[PDB]
Symmetry: D2
Subunit: 266 residues, 4 copies
Amino acid sequence: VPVALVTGAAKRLGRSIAEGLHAEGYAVCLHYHRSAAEANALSATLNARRPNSAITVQADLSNVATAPAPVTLFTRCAELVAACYTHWGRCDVLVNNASSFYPTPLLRGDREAMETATADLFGSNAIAPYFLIKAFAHRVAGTPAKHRGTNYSIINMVDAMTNQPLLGYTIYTMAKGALEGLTRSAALELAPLQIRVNGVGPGLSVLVDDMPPAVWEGHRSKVPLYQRDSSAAEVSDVVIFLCSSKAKYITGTCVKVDGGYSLTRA
Amino acid sequence: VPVALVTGAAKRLGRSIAEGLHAEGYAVCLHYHRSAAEANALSATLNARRPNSAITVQADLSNVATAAPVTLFTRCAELVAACYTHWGRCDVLVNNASSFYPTPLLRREAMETATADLFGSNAIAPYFLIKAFAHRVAGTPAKHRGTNYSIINMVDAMTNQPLLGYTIYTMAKGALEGLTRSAALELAPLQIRVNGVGPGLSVLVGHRSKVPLYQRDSSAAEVSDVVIFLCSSKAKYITGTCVKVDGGYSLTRA
Amino acid sequence: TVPVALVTGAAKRLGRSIAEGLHAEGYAVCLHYHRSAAEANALSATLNARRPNSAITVQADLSNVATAPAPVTLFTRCAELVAACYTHWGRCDVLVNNASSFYPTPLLRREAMETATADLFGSNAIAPYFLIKAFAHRVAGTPAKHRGTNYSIINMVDAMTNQPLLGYTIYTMAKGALEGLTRSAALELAPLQIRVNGVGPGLSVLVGHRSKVPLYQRDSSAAEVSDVVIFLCSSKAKYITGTCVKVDGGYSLTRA
Amino acid sequence: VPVALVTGAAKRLGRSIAEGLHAEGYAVCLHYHRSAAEANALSATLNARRPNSAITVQADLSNVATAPVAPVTLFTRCAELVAACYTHWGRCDVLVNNASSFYPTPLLRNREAMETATADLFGSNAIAPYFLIKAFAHRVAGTPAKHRGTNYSIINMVDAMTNQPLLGYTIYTMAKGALEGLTRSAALELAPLQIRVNGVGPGLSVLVDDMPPAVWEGHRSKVPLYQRDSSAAEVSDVVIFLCSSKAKYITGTCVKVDGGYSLTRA
Ligand SMILES: NC(=O)C1=CN([C@@H]2O[C@H](COP(=O)(O)OP(=O)(O)OC[C@H]3O[C@@H](n4cnc5c(N)ncnc54)[C@H](OP(=O)(O)O)[C@@H]3O)[C@@H](O)[C@H]2O)C=CC1
Ligand SMILES: NC(=O)C1=CN([C@@H]2O[C@H](COP(=O)(O)OP(=O)(O)OC[C@H]3O[C@@H](n4cnc5c(N)ncnc54)[C@H](OP(=O)(O)O)[C@@H]3O)[C@@H](O)[C@H]2O)C=CC1
Ligand SMILES: NC(=O)C1=CN([C@@H]2O[C@H](COP(=O)(O)OP(=O)(O)OC[C@H]3O[C@@H](n4cnc5c(N)ncnc54)[C@H](OP(=O)(O)O)[C@@H]3O)[C@@H](O)[C@H]2O)C=CC1
Ligand SMILES: NC(=O)C1=CN([C@@H]2O[C@H](COP(=O)(O)OP(=O)(O)OC[C@H]3O[C@@H](n4cnc5c(N)ncnc54)[C@H](OP(=O)(O)O)[C@@H]3O)[C@@H](O)[C@H]2O)C=CC1
Ligand SMILES: COc1cc(Cc2cnc(N)nc2N)cc(OC)c1OC
Ligand SMILES: COc1cc(Cc2cnc(N)nc2N)cc(OC)c1OC
């Protein structure tokens, strides 16, 4: 029974990914930060379909120390991987999906929305993924060859549109650039242990409708294929395929799931 | 029952792709140039597992006239037509056929045939085939159209790090990548997806020890399986992108 | 010592600004043209007036077709272009593949399909290939002691081809081939110290669309592009090779 | 008389860049961290060539708070660097993010180390550049249009080889990917103020030889053009050109100065 750890698994794409892996027979460690209710509701459904196929772990992946001596981001990340080994004795798949997304304009007490944004955006999107990968790799390396899984796979959720940045989202964009970098570096270094590291880059998926309907139809109509944002499955299915043994030769690459959005120009 | 046209389907990757699509329920038009025996043997196997699930069509995809003189465009249209004539539809196109040999820049008509052969098979033919494919979908009344039109271009994961002496081939692959993006954008309104699959080193005829993952060339399946997935309805949101199937080779340096 | 530059499609717009730019650096210039005979000759006169014997003009169709005398092939025509530089000045230091046909070839909605393909693919890709091969043979054939010290080939590419212009498939394909040529030629010709780079304009000297460019909200001047070509040719850029420089004012960073 | 701020200007490429800009008529603020002697020696030479054409500011660009005389954050330290240009000369026209730590952070084959490394590598190569750009931009924005310079230019020192990562240098590679991201995001957002943001990516320049001669030669004989590492001028001259008014249409692009190294494969 293979195990998958999905960060930010409570809802939207993270939920669809977790559900997708679960349908392939995976036991799933659903990580969450604030969405406790939703995470627990998802665990219940999965555990109902298949007894002992889901657990829930809470963690702030922001680059800050947590409350008692203080706990570092690294420790918190190691604990996430450990929870998989403690409960099921293994961890075969890692999906770095958790991600903060809000503006940090280069143009205009207060240093709160200053230092906290950097650590939140950079930690969730890049530093935490880094530590999680190290921890994941360490556990594989420590396992005697005779007891290793046969299909280790790490998926990093990136962004198909960062080459054409969203105005005002500099740190987020910077953070995603770092994640792409991690994908290539990790793929190369972990190749001898047969651990594949790839990336999935959504364009517009399950677009949040907290705006005037027309403005919302304005965004989705810019996508050349279907003139709409994608469903969560349209993205999660790709993540699932990259984790399958049929994709065992793919590593170090980023797959755009954007319906041709990146091919547009103003 | 959906139809797939695979150029250069007789052996190696082309064969594995055809076999892969066939296992998903597709009727397959196996294209070939010189490999007549191999192509016919493959059709027999597929037709034996499922009656009327395979045919074979011969064509030179080089940018020249043949058999008054028949142009490359006509030959390409005939390939697509053969699918409509036999089965009444064509849902998938896989531009896999490709010549691959050196054209050194440093030491007559031997290059004249090389240019048209390498550029035709790898880029010009694919262009005409897509055009023919798109014309046929457009001409079909909306109510009768298939629900999963997909075109796959076989590109190269290593062309950003060129193989010494293979300029025309490398140029041709660059054109094919360009075709993938342009076609994806123009055919989007008809729900025709256009993507690319880029192998690194697959089923070699030394250097394979330098592939970071497994330290070997890939099997044909390790590549064909990706082409199959991109054709599945699960991948319906993917278009205009190239997927590397190279085991991390493109991440290396000298 | 006066170095020589061959600039294809040098009669007007960017090609002319490139030729003028190289000429102001002391280069003797071979202005190639196809149909623009009058402009090419007027440009030669100006350059030859400023500096005697610093310009010549040569005519050639760079389309992938055979012309009548055994028909003259595109390769031969390209070799002749490079030869004209050696015949007149005894050297060829810089090659700028600038000539380019640009019109739609829609996928949706006969003689023109065959002539469009060879015209767009030849001018934008096959001619540049043959020209580079011819340029390289001549350098290779020249005894080491006699070789120039700054061999540079510039390919005019396109900053926006990753975000294709709707309906321009063959042109877009041709530019992709040219980028491929830039990398392949840079690698193979490195032992001979011949550098091969690319310059990719976005919107330059156009004949509401330009208001979409992030920088200045306008199309560029010819100089704003040619000056980059000139710098990449300078000895100060002797370590750059196999790279494409976008000169687009951030246009490629936009999205619909 | 235009002003240029060059971080990590004390030696090698940073020096060559400062010297390059100085020869074009620029007044130069030379930043340094631990190379005080070399920085002061460089200031002396430049000031001897042209009185009052050079100053020096010390700063740790690592993502950590320092000890004042309430700690001082990285952001404040960055604002102070830009401020020093305005205080001394009343202007700042060019910013060159050159300062950079570069050492291994392995994923495998293995505390205080895995803490300070992250902030040092990520701060110097990405977080500091972000804050510096932000500070530079408010400064231009706060200047009345009539008093603005006519050629604002920011150059970020990136890496031509990060798409083919150096084994074991994950954080560094991740940091460079963030920097590329910053170059595109800033270019787009600062375009209305006519501030250009570009990248220059060296391959092998002035290679360190703390290794056997053969190993050093090996690395050098892999560069296709000349079979050698570049001189500092071969790189700095490109930075200087991108800053010239002749390059006023270039923005958001990265220029490789690698002699074809990125075109190679194993
Ligand atoms: N959807 C889209 O249009 C696009 C998505 N992507 C990428 O795809 C992935 C998934 O997309 P989507 O579903 O929209 O993502 P969401 O924006 O919904 O965020 C996913 C989860 O990340 C968690 N999270 C946020 N910050 C932190 C943090 N500080 N520490 C720990 N967890 C945190 C949250 O969990 P919780 O609720 O428990 O707090 C949140 O539900 C993301 O990585 C995103 O970057 C990229 C481009 C476009
Ligand atoms: N295998 C690899 O390591 C790599 C492969 N690729 C790409 O993957 C694809 C498949 O790879 P692979 O199986 O090795 O390909 P092959 O080299 O075996 O060629 C495929 C087929 O193309 C057909 N073909 C060649 N020239 C022509 C022509 N002038 N007109 C019509 N058909 C022609 C041949 O068919 P016939 O026998 O009937 O004449 C041949 O069997 C190719 O497109 C290739 O470019 C890219 C990088 C690496
Ligand atoms: N300007 C722009 O906005 C952009 C330009 N570019 C590229 O920059 C380069 C220069 O741009 P621009 O000045 O606008 O180019 P032009 O469109 O003005 O064309 C340049 C010249 O190419 C020559 N030419 C065209 N077809 C042929 C052919 N069949 N055989 C021989 N010569 C031919 C013509 O010469 P003649 O008059 O003598 O017949 C023409 O004057 C081109 O390569 C273009 O692709 C790329 C993106 C944008
Ligand atoms: N040289 C090469 O082969 C390559 C260089 N590059 C990039 O080019 C740029 C310049 O190259 P190079 O001259 O080799 O750079 P160096 O390795 O010599 O470093 C440049 C300077 O950065 C400063 N620095 C390092 N860490 C910090 C920090 N924590 N806070 C403040 N300053 C710091 C140091 O200044 P001080 O001495 O005062 O402490 C150092 O002298 C760099 O950004 C590098 O990443 C990229 C690829 C290859
Ligand atoms: C194209 O414009 C927008 C696109 C998106 C999509 C998006 C992009 N990235 C991430 N991480 N999440 C998203 N929802 C989100 C937006 O903001 C809600 C946009 O408007 C500024
Ligand atoms: C290819 O291997 C190496 C390459 C480099 C180049 C290099 C790469 N990045 C930076 N910032 N500086 C450099 N000198 C530097 C090295 O030294 C640590 C290498 O290891 C021997």
